[PDB]
Design a protein around this ligand. Structure first.
Ligand SMILES: CC(C)(COP(=O)(O)OP(=O)(O)OC[C@H]1O[C@@H](n2cnc3c(N)ncnc32)[C@H](O)[C@@H]1OP(=O)(O)O)[C@@H](O)C(=O)NCCC(=O)NCCS
Length: 151
């Protein structure tokens, strides 16, 4: 069974392990533990009795930024990243959020595809934005319009 819930403080060690494993460019610890707390709507997906995925999102006024989505490699290509993001988008709609923003490196084919399927649009391309061991890499800024529902 797949259960989506709030990512609480006790969940953070588990999510910090998934971060190191899943991301080609993991966050630092200070970045990871800082992106929690007020204005954060952070979520986990629990597959059976294991954390499968988490998502880090900050809500400001009627907009939101997805800072992080990660699916544990053991769980990838199984629909769980899409599922987590769908429950997030639904949750953002109930909160009056009209646009979900993210930024993604141009070579992240899997992320880019996930976002395409959810309806994210390319807002802009930041040329040579991310410094890497290889030099620089473009960042794509994407926006998902979230249409208002009756409640
Ligand atoms: C991006 C990520 C969250 C996708 O989650 P997931 O649960 O594996 O993806 P899903 O199974 O829900 O499917 C999402 C879509 O992306 C496509 N996709 C997923 N992995 C892919 C891959 N490795 N290569 C190409 N396409 C891929 C899927 O086929 C699906 O699109 P489609 O069914 O219309 O073809 C996962 O790859 C991950 O954790 N990556 C590392 C963390 C990361 O880089 N996050 C994004 C920036 S913070």
């Amino acid at each position: 069974m797949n259960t989506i819930s709030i990512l609480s403080t006790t969940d953070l060690p588990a999510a910090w392990q998934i971060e190191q494993r899943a991301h080609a460019f993991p966050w630092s610890e200070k970045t990871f533990f800082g992106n929690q707390g007020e204005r954060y709507l952070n979520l986990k997906l629990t597959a059976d009795d294991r954390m499968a995925a988490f998502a880090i999102t900050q809500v400001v006024l009627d907009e939101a930024t997805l800072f992080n989505i990660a699916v544990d490699p053991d769980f990838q290509r199984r629909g769980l990243g899409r599922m987590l993001l769908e429950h997030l988008i639904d949750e953002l709609e109930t909160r009056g959020v009209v646009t979900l923003w993210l930024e993604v490196r141009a070579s992240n084919a899997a992320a880019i595809a996930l976002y395409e399927s959810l309806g994210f649009n390319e807002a802009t391309i930041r040329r040579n934005y991310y410094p890497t061991a290889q030099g620089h890499e473009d960042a794509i800024i994407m926006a998902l319009p979230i249409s208002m529902k009756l409640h």
